[PDB]
Subunit: 71 residues, 7 copies
Amino acid sequence: EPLDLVRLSLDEIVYVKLRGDRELNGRLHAYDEHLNMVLGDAEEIVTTIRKHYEMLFVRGDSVILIAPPRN
Amino acid sequence: EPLDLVRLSLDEIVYVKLRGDRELNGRLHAYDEHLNMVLGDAEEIVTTIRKHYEMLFVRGDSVILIAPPRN
Amino acid sequence: EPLDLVRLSLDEIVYVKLRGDRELNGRLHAYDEHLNMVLGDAEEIVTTIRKHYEMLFVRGDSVILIAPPRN
Amino acid sequence: EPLDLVRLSLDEIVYVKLRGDRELNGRLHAYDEHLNMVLGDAEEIVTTIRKHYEMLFVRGDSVILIAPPRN
Amino acid sequence: EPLDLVRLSLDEIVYVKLRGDRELNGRLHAYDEHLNMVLGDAEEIVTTIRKHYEMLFVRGDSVILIAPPRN
Amino acid sequence: EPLDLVRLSLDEIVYVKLRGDRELNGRLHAYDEHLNMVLGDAEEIVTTIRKHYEMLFVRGDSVILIAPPRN
Amino acid sequence: EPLDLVRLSLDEIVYVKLRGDRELNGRLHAYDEHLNMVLGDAEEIVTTIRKHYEMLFVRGDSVILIAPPRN
């Protein structure tokens, strides 16, 4: 049930809050049971210093929040 | 028995304290054995900077307290 | 044996010390093998800023000490 | 073999060092495989602010050292 | 699926963000289920003090992000 | 193979570095698979405030380094 | 595959980065699946205060990086 939110966000642009002052935005291309994700066209925001990635692998362990697009 | 409190809070508005100066309020739409939750119409409060989400996935690992709505 | 202390505290008012400058007092309504608890009429004390809850779910992982009421 | 030390200290007054500036002294009434303990007539020392408990449950995870009384 | 990104990066030059102010760049020679990696011709950047290694073993546990080379 | 060093140190005086500014010296009387030890005639050094114990139980989880006596 | 690097470093002089400002250099005499190592003629560097050991046991849990000698 709770993971349904991540699953319905496949190919949508998600917001991800990681542990310790880091955030991401990107298109969810893939995820797994551990909450590992691959984000496409991703922006990383340390707070502000930004960084952009064509493809980004995010380690599940460090994910705190995931929000789908308003849509 | 203790998880009964989370279970009876399905569709109620819960308060959630996370690790490290973060709090949430939202409608509990879903949870699992790991204490992962989906919160609807959720407010995040870092302390104070606020943020609002239509739908929010919260990682169970970071949950310290959950309080149901009063009455 | 050691968990007997928590068990005999069912419905008594317990003191709970959590990781990192947080404490609780409340009536133990429920607990489980992970040391998750539901505390009734609970006070949370960060040190001092206080907060009160009619019903509180506490995540076992963060519990360091539990003391039953005196006598 | 190493746990024998804790076992032989049953009913003796043990010193316990916990993670992060905390110490205990008390009569070992019970312990388990996780190193959870119940300490009787226990003194807690944060360093110095002291606190006393008639009975105290200590979570095993946070125990770093245990010393038995000097015979 | 998400690990596919690491797998398709075999022999490419990857960027790796580790916990706590450390980054790496190097040629991915090997990885495993734990996300342990061996990086060839690797640069380590603490932030800035740099360090270079002909071959580097990175512990999986400390990996937060992995980004494959562009284009 | 690596644990052989701990095993050959039985009854020798070992140095032990724990997490977070703590060190021990003592006679290794016992150890287990978790790296729990009992140290005899042990000195604990926080850095410098020292403390001495006739018998000391050390929790394996917090052990970083173990050095056997020279020769 | 990734552990091959550690394995091929048997009897070579390796550099090891541990968690939290600590480094080691020594001759790799032994290692195991957990990444526990015994380092011979080892130097420990906290950053700078140095320390030397004839034989050193290193707990695998705290190892972040391992680099074999050049060529």
